[PDB]
């Protein structure tokens, strides 16, 4: 029964574990960073990524696919809503444009699936946050907590037990951060961990202060000295 | 040279239409889904076209959605256009045409999605239809698509009456699940409900799309628990 | 590796050269970077030489000796300096390969020709293989390889050395400090070298050490270097010693496990390595099933005898395939001892800890967890009852406290093919479990209750009925009877003792039975749960073999027609042909369970016809033509004198078919016949017309029933008339209903197949109202499904009954009027009743002579084409009929 | 029989429309007879589920306008977008032109739309026939066509559609002659009477009729007088 | 009453499995039994039928031992073999037998006369041109199987195909 | 019976070892297997005959036309009317109409024929495209002319042609029996002896269609009375 997108599935679970988590007040999306050689600057490259101040993204699967996925999915979230509208897309809206730009390289021959699975999670007015999953299918499904990759099956049954209404962003970070360290395949340091959030705002990284309008971004990246303050509890 | 495109829709879940001598009743069952997955959300069974119909769908709501987004903008269109809300009739052969067109057309692939139109208008009164991927569609007394289907259609046919009220479409839609059920014990948060009834009092079509408290109200009259 | 074992010589410097590369690699680095899902480029280079040294080593045999302290020394630095988990794996394969040289016997030599030896002449481009000369010990004398002292002084100075090393290791770090991610692999590596021991010194190992405790026969003896009698075994101390680490390494696991549970619940991959490490625990005994098949360095014995094999020629092989064949025997003998012991009590605790891993929730620990249980199940006897009575309890555990994930792990468990065909022998405890999954079908969470439901339908389709039958030859035991008419006295005791457990599990299968018809008569809102219900009274009612019939299971089954559902129907008529065709088969088997599987009984109704009479050729051509006063009948398809006549032929009796049947039996049929109301067929009738509204099926099942009805009104059980079947009938031809006319036509069928039992003015009733209703049915108007539904009958009806029964239905088709006329117009009428006609006389293959009537009445020139076709496709059917 | 020295393919090509052809046997019978001054179309009606509304249930024999009908065999599905396709022409035409829509014309046009849905190769057929019928503007000529999913069409004095059609056009061609038709409406009823209940699938719910005469007078004959017109003789 | 139905898949196992052990055992029903063929081949014959060819034929090649004596022989029921072959379109379900029944009596004639034990059994059994076929039975067995591999694929084992030839 | 196959057999646009496109030559023998086609070109006309296929006596008329008007100077004549045939048809129409418009005058029998053959190479917009046809005018540069265009596009004038069943000896006897003396009426009755010996000896109205083109009427398709009498001065002609 099997087809080329069945084969974009088995890319997606041999990649590197990265997970979300949903909790009452934010959301945490999150990801092992695995070097090729220790003469490798880790900086270098973004595991996770802002598509709106207020939506962020994960993979697993192909990097190269995800970066060049990103970079179509950021113009995406430009051309269709920042210039015409005025303003950012719901995380809903974007999943679909995400989710169709999958959906035309499945479709068109002479074309290949792209080799990665995707959680977006962010912040809208109307629907609050949101957690979703976008596969190489072109599909998309709302997920309260979800894995992907190789640790998929341990971490799913780990959030399964983890879970409930209640968590707080900051617990939901200590959650990830257990599911995370169950998994690692290279070291366990704030160097190895990459780790976002969104949750609320944040006006210091609107980078400019006066038009009380604008609030900056809900999306934050830690850095790895934040990482390594919660690794010493963790 | 589209049945494997109604093999789809038998797995899919169970929704039941009966029309009353002064109403119509939709029921459906959400599948029983992973913890994690969220329920919250709009892609649910039934949804609505406008103020005057409702749907139930079974197949895929990314199928669904589609044609329910047609359908809301074709019939927001034609309140615009005539200041009088578009017949249940010209609906379901509208997104009957639409489906038609994309199996016959070898460029597209048949929408793998079946919904139970509910509707009022006064050119027919109450209107309660079905339409499937081959892109026909039949005027019902009671129906049902989806999983059990044949065996809800012959507790249907055997306790269906011609002049029953709302009330007894009601039960009959309740009691026909809690025989069909794939659970042995139904619950409100598998069950979605609908009805299309005559006003408070006065002339005007009352839509409700029950909430979760309403479902339980009625599941604990219809000794369902 | 293969260098090695045809020359020990060249092992000391090959063995020394990679252990000092190895050396300069782990100073060089190399497996200093952690990655748990690759070997690192810098790390292939130490790969190659550890993967090197594991197969030289493999083949090394008595010339590890000269260098066993210095490889010794080796493999604790090993153990010290490198921990990335990829290698772990590999670095422990150096025990397995050091141990498994030293205590293993396998052949050595392989050689096309003997070391340089004997004298075959320089014409051998062939390797003897059809030179006669092949078969020759001085050709075929293999060296072989058979452990020495001083090699098993060695293997067990090695065992115990690795083995307490790693003991002293993880015990000094066993305080739980943290999750390093570190800690976690040298707990994993300390572990894999006790797994690496247990494989490699497997052949040192005893299967029965524990029946030694503090004349047996073996036909598979291998070479063991104890001894082969419990004496010889017992008299070495180096036996004790060998079993001893082994009962050391076994309580290290199970302290290990509370470790790691206390401690590290959630860390799949440390459960995983101590799964693995108990399946080589409770499976390497005497023997060793892991790297047992995977590539090796000696040649395969399936290749070569691909390449060498003839298919009529005697063993066309050089001497290379001979030695691979004698070490194949070898194998085959040490694989072919048994495993099988009664466990130890370490052996029971380390079982009761690999049930809670297979009740574990993480897919990563249970499935690992369940493929070692089975494993387990094989090696220790009775485990499938310490199993059950651990699995039973959690289950109920897991329903009382609402432990959902736990629950479908446990069914799951259930579904496990060995534990699955072990359920349905289960009598003592399938009734503990059909209750606990009764209530498992209430849980709506997940999959649980489509699992239970599941595994309900599997124990009532696949349940194990005891047999008190047994028709065999006494030539299929007599041959063997040994010359003591006296000792065997044990037969006898034997089959009283099979009687009485035969007897107490039958009583198990009829108190669940009686247990379950209690619960579906007083649960009023069990639900639609009830389908495997009455499904278990069905094969249990129906069984036959010394099964009693009860008339609270035909009450309560009929009963359920009070809900509406289709299914249950289906099943509630189904269930109550099943269980009154059980008794009729009692009845005409004169309470003789036996005659149901013996070839010279044939019932009181079935009569045998000479067949061979001077006159019998010719009175079979009267008799099959005697509608007014037939001598017997034969229903189904006629065979003997198709092509000749001669051996005795099987006919029906032309009489009514009386059941003769004791006080338990008329009270069942009594109570199935009160409860046959007109009410009752009413609603059951109108139900199946109903669910028939989409498929439009023609049903046997259905004529079955109606055929039972038949009996029990002609037997006096029933207090409906013949005339209630016929205003049935009646009342459900509508021209526009096919599901509705198919019911009507029905029971027309079961009428014409209830002749059997029905009396002479009954008979004459039945044929007067087929008359009439054949006539208002086809004669004046018939739409295309009501062609349809009586074609079907007419295909099916002469092929399950002889048409002789009735005077008035086969009468009706061959007389019918205008089926040939010329002038008609109406040619689908005419056309229909040709084609009723042919289905007929098609179905009676060889058989209602004198239709020679018909050859005068066909027409060859009709205007319209369908009729046309349908006196061609008549005139086919006749000459057929007469050509035998 | 056609493998000769075991040849295949030595024309190398095929061209294929029958499968739709098939379902236009399947389907209902569709029967149309010319009188003298009238023609008549009559229908069979499938057997209704239990539990259907009929309410809505459209007529089978379907008005294009005023003086012109079409029936069908074959899938309702496709025989819906050949009617709407049908009635908006038969609307643009009447504007456009100013005068209604010429029967051979509106054949031109249904032969039109299922030829292109031949020709274009990423479209199956439609799985229908039609039967056109009535009168040309200011005419009394009675006019009867068919198409077929091939894109064909024809001209016809009677014609039937159908599973058991073949048996109809034998009392057709039994009872019709061209040089003496049925003429007066009460024989052209009759003979379409007869027609259907002879080979019909037929029921308790059974056969739709719809009679066109000139000059626009398009008329289905009560479920009485279908029954009013059932005079026999029998022996 | 009728326990067995060859069409349902658990009962035609059952029936290949006793033909199977039919086969096998064969060899040890008894010649001294003078009446054995001709009383089996007497019920086998007039119990045959369309209705009964498909047990029939299976039982025949199966069960019927290889006996010759004076009066019966096996080779007595060849002419009887050919009217069905002969008779009817080549068909997996009838040729398969045919030539399973041919070939088999073939091989056990040959190797009785290469044994020393054919001075009791297959004497005034002769081994001809075309072995114990006539000139008319080796014609239609040769147009038989170049019809299978040229026209009609009917052959299930070619190995009891090749048997007889 | 035995098989000849080879290893270039159904390859598309491919080459053989020989230099042979085997798809374009099926497709060109596939032109055997149609309806019966004749034309005579004479001094006088060019006649078109067709064999039509038996029909129902209830059928009035039917838009099946074997043979068919492209113009009044040009007529066609097909073995097959699949819908490449409708599209080689319309094809020609709109040449036919869109030369006219362009150069006030009548397009030649050879520009047209050649036009047809064009849309076969182009398939529309080494394939082979549609079915045989024989087309038939009257120009003033090149007089009456009778062309066989091919399914492969490329074509040749002949003086009598017969295409569908009967090839060999249907072409056969044309050749025993054209002069460049044969006036019209001649070339009828041989049109339609030709067609009553490829028919395994039948000739009716029914059976036989005609038509000619000349100068002063064009083309134009002989009503079923103008063939029955023809049919009978044949009968008759025979028999003398």
């Known amino acids: 029964k099997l087809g080329q997108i069945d084969y974009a599935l088995t890319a997606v679970k041999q990649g590197v574990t990265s997970l979300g988590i949903k909790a009452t007040n934010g959301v945490v999306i999150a990801t092992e960073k695995k070097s090729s050689s220790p003469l490798a600057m880790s900086e270098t490259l973004s595991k996770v990524s802002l598509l709106t101040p207020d939506i962020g993204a994960v993979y697993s699967g192909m990097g190269p696919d995800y970066r060049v996925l990103v970079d179509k999915s950021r113009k995406v979230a430009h051309t269709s809503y920042k210039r015409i509208y005025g303003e950012y897309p719901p995380t809903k809206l974007l999943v679909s444009e995400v989710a169709k730009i999958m959906q035309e390289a499945t479709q068109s021959g002479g074309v290949r699936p792209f080799g990665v699975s995707l959680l977006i999670a962010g912040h809208d007015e109307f629907n609050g946050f949101s957690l979703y999953q976008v596969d190489p299918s072109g599909s998309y499904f709302p997920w309260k907590a979800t894995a992907i990759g190789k640790g998929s099956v341990a971490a799913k049954t780990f959030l399964e037990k983890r879970w409930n209404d209640e968590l707080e962003l900051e617990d939901a970070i200590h959650i990830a951060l257990l599911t995370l360290k169950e998994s690692v395949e290279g070291e366990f340091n704030g160097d190895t961990i990459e780790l976002a959030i969104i949750g609320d705002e944040n006006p210091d990284l609107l980078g400019y202060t006066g038009i009380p309008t604008d609030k900056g971004p809900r999306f934050r990246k830690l850095t790895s000295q934040e990482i390594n303050d919660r690794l010493e509890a963790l | 040279q589209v049945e494997y495109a109604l093999e789809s829709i038998s797995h899919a879940g169970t929704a039941i239409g009966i029309m009353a001598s002064d109403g119509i009743v939709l029921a459906a069952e959400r599948k029983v889904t992973s913890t994690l997955l969220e329920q919250d959300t709009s892609t649910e069974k039934l949804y609505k076209l406008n103020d005057k119909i409702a749907v139930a769908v079974a197949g895929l709501t990314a199928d669904a959605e589609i044609l329910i987004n047609t359908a809301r903008i074709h019939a927001q269109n034609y309140l615009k256009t005539y200041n009088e809300d578009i017949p249940v009739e010209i609906l379901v052969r509208r997104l009957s045409d639409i489906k038609q067109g994309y199996t016959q057309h070898g460029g597209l692939r048949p929408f793998g999605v079946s919904f139970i139109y509910a509707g009022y208008d006064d050119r027919y009164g109450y209107q309660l239809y079905t339409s499937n991927p081959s892109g026909n569609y039949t005027g019902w007394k009671a129906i049902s698509v989806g999983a059990n289907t044949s065996a809800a259609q012959t507790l249907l046919q055997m306790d269906y009456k011609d002049d029953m009220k709302v009330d007894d479409a009601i039960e009959l839609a309740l009691k026909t699940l809690s025989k069909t059920t794939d659970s042995s014990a139904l619950t409100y948060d598998r069950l979605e409900f609908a009805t299309i009834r005559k006003g408070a009092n006065d002339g005007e079509v009352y839509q409700k799309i029950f909430k979760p408290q309403e479902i339980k109200d009625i599941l604990v009259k219809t000794g369902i628990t | 590796a293969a260098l090695v074992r045809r020359n020990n010589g060249l092992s000391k410097e090959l063995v020394r050269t990679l252990l000092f590369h190895i050396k300069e690699q782990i100073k060089r680095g190399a497996g200093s970077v952690r990655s748990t899902s690759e070997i690192q480029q810098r790390d292939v280079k130490l790969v190659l030489y550890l993967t090197a040294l594991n197969d030289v080593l493999r083949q090394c045999h008595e010339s590890l000796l000269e260098y066993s302290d210095e490889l010794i020394t080796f493999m604790k630095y090993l153990y010290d300096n490198v921990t990335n988990p990829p290698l772990d794996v590999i670095t422990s394969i150096v025990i397995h390969s050091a141990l498994a040289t030293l205590c293993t016997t396998e052949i050595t030599d392989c050689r096309l020709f003997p070391e340089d030896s004997k004298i075959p002449e320089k014409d051998r481009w062939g390797g003897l293989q059809f030179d006669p000369r092949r078969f020759d010990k001085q050709h075929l004398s293999f060296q072989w390889h058979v452990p020495s002292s001083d090699e098993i002084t060695l293997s067990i100075s090695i065992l115990e050395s690795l083995s307490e090393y790693c003991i002293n290791n993880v015990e000094e770090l066993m305080k739980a400090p943290r999750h390093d991610s570190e800690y976690g692999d040298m707990i994993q590596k300390y572990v894999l070298v006790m797994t690496h021991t247990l494989s490699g010194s497997s052949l040192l190992f005893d299967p029965d050490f524990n029946k030694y405790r503090t004349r047996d026969l073996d036909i598979y003896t291998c070479n063991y270097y104890f001894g082969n009698t419990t004496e010889e075994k017992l008299q070495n101390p180096q036996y004790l010693q060998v079993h001893r680490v082994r009962a050391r390494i076994g309580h290290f696991f199970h302290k290990l496990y509370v470790f790691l549970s206390t401690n590290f619940e959630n860390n799949t991959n440390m459960f995983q390595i101590l799964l693995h490490g108990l399946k080589v625990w409770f499976t390497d005994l005497g023997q060793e099933t892991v790297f047992n098949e995977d590539p090796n360095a000696f040649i395969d014995v399936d290749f070569l005898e691909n390449v060498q094999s003839l298919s009529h020629v005697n063993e066309p092989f050089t001497r290379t395939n001979f030695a691979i064949r004698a070490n194949s025997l070898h194998q085959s003998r040490v694989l072919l001892h048994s495993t099988n012991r009664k466990a130890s009590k370490l052996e029971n605790l380390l079982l009761v800890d690999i049930i809670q891993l297979a009740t574990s929730l993480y897919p990563d620990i249970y499935k690992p967890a369940q493929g070692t249980l089975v494993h387990c199940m094989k090696q220790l006897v009775g485990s499938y009852g310490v199993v059950i009575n651990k699995i039973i309890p959690s289950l109920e555990k897991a329903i009382k406290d609402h432990d959902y994930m736990k629950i479908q792990v446990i069914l799951n468990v259930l579904l496990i093919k060995k534990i699955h065909r072990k359920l349905m022998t289960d009598y003592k405890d399938i009734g503990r479990l059909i209750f606990l999954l009764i209530e498992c079908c209430r849980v709506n969470e997940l999959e649980i209750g489509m699992y239970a439901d599941k595994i309900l339908t599997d124990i009532v389709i696949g349940i194990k009925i005891p047999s008190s039958v047994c028709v065999i030859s006494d030539q299929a035991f007599l041959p063997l009877a040994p010359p003591d008419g006296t000792i065997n006295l044990q037969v006898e005791a034997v089959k009283l003792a099979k009687k009485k457990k035969r007897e107490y599990y039958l009583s198990l299968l009829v108190d669940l039975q009686d247990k379950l018809l209690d619960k579906l008569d007083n649960e009023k809102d069990m639900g639609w749960k009830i389908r495997m219900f009455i499904l278990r009274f069905v094969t249990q009612i129906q069984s036959n073999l010394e099964s009693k019939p009860d008339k609270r299971a035909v009450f309560s089954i009929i009963s359920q027609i009070s809900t509406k559902h289709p299914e249950i129907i289906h099943l509630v008529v189904k269930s109550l042909l099943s269980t009154c065709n059980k008794i009729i088969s009692l009845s005409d088997y004169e309470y003789d369970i036996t005659r149901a599987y013996k070839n010279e009984f044939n019932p009181s109704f079935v009569e045998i016809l000479d067949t061979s009479t001077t006159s019998f050729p010719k009175t079979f051509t009267e008799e099959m033509n005697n509608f007014d006063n037939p001598k017997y009948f034969i229903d189904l398809r006629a065979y003997v004198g198709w092509l000749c006549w001669g051996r005795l032929m099987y006919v029906m009796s032309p009489k009514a078919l009386k059941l003769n049947l004791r006080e338990n039996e008329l009270e069942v049929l009594k109570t199935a016949g009160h409860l046959l109301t007109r009410e009752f067929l009413r609603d059951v009738t109108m139900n199946l017309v109903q669910d028939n509204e989409t498929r439009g099926v023609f049903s046997s099942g259905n004529v079955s029933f109606f055929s039972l009805v038949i009996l029990l009104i002609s037997s006096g059980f029933c207090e409906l008339n013949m005339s209630d079947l016929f205003e049935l009938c009646e009342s459900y031809y509508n021209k526009d209903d096919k599901a509705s006319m198919i019911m009507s036509v029905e029971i027309v069928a079961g009428l014409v197949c209830g002749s059997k039992f029905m009396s002479v003015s009954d008979l004459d009733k039945r044929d007067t109202f087929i008359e009439n209703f054949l006539a208002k049915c086809l004669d004046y108007e018939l739409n295309h499904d009501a062609f349809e539904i009586w074609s079907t009958l007419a295909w099916w009806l002469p092929a399950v009954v002889d048409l002789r029964r009735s005077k008035t239905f086969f009468c009706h088709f061959i007389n019918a009027d205008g089926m040939f006329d010329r002038e008609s117009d109406a040619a689908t009428h005419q056309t229909s009743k040709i084609y009723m006609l042919r289905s007929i006389l098609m179905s009676m293959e060889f058989r209602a002579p004198d239709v020679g009537k018909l050859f005068d009445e066909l027409v060859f020139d009709h205007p319209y084409d369908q009729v046309r076709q349908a006196v061609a496709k008549l005139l086919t059917t006749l000459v057929q009929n007469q050509s035998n | 029989y056609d493998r000769a020295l075991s040849i295949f393919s030595p024309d190398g090509h095929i061209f294929q429309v029958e499968y739709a052809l098939e379902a236009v046997k399947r389907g209902t019978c569709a029967v149309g007879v010319k009188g003298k001054n009238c023609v008549v179309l009559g229908c069979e009606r499938r057997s209704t589920l239990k539990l259907q509304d009929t309410r809505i249930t459209p007529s089978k024999v379907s008005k294009i306008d005023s003086h012109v009908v079409l029936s069908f065999s074959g899938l309702n599905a496709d025989s819906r977008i050949l009617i709407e396709k049908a009635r908006v022409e038969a609307q643009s035409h009447r504007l456009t032109l100013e005068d209604p829509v010429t029967v051979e014309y509106l054949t031109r046009y249904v032969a039109g739309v299922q030829q292109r849905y031949t020709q274009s190769g990423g479209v199956r057929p439609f799985g229908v026939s039609t039967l056109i019928a009535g009168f040309d503007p200011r005419d009394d000529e009675p006019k009867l066509y068919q198409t077929e999913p091939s894109g064909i069409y024809s001209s016809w004095s009677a014609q039937t559609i159908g599973r058991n059609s073949k048996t109809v056009r034998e009392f057709l061609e039994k009872n019709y002659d061209r040089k003496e038709p049925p003429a007066t409406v009460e024989e052209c009823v009759k003979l379409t009477v007869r027609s259907l209940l002879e080979v019909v699938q037929t029921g308790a719910k059974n056969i739709e009729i719809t009679v066109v005469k000139p000059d626009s007078d398009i008329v289905a004959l009560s479920s009485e007088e279908i029954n009013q017109y059932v005079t026999q003789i029998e022996q | ?165 | 019976m035995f098989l000849t196959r080879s290893e270039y057999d159904r390859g598309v646009s491919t080459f053989s070892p020989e230099g042979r496109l085997f798809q374009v030559e099926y497709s060109l023998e596939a032109i055997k297997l149609g309806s019966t086609a004749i034309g005579i070109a004479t001094k006088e006309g060019v006649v078109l005959g067709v064999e039509k296929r038996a029909t129902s006596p209830l059928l009035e008329s039917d838009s099946i036309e074997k043979i068919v008007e492209i113009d009044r100077h040009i007529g066609c004549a097909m073995s097959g009317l699949t819908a490449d045939a409708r599209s080689m048809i319309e094809h020609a129409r709109t040449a036919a109409v869109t030369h006219n418009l362009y150069y006030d005058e009548d397009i030649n029998v050879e520009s047209l024929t050649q036009s047809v053959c064009d849309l076969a190479l182009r398939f529309g917009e080494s394939r082979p495209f549609g079915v045989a046809l024989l087309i038939a005018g009257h120009d003033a540069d090149d007089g009456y002319q009778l062309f066989h265009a091919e399914p492969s596009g490329t074509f040749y004038r002949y003086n009598a042609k017969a295409i569908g069943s009967g090839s060999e000896g249907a072409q056969a006897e044309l050749l025993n029996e054209w002069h460049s003396s044969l006036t019209l009426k001649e070339a009828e009755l041989l049109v339609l002896k030709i067609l009553k010996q490829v028919m395994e000896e039948k000739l009716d109205e029914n059976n036989a269609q005609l038509s000619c083109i000349t100068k002063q009427d064009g083309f134009k398709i002989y009503d079923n009375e103008k063939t029955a009498e023809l049919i009978k001065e044949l009968k008759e002609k025979e028999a003398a």
């Not at chain 5, 009453?1 to 499995?17: G, M, P, V, W």
């Not at chain 5, 081994?127 to 591999?149: A, P, Y």
């Open chain 5, 1 to 165: 009453y009728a326990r067995y139905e060859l069409s349902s898949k658990e009962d035609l196992q059952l029936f290949r499995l006793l033909l199977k052990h039919a086969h096998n055992a064969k060899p040890f029903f008894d010649k001294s039994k003078e009446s054995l063929l001709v009383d089996t081949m007497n019920f086998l014959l007039s119990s045959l039928a369309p209705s009964t060819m498909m047990a029939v034929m299976p039982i025949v090649t199966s069960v019927v031992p290889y006996h010759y004596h004076i009066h019966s022989k096996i080779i007595d029921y060849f002419p009887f073999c050919y009217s069905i072959w002969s008779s009817v379109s080549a068909n997996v379900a009838i040729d398969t037998h045919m030539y399973d029944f041919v070939g088999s009596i073939s091989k056990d004639v040959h190797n009785k006369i290469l044994s020393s034990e054919h001075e009791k059994d297959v004497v005034g059994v002769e081994f001809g041109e075309f072995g114990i076929f006539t000139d008319d039975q080796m014609t239609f067995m040769f147009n038989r199987l170049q019809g299978h591999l040229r026209t009609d694929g009917q052959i299930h084992s070619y190995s009891r195909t090749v048997k007889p030839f």
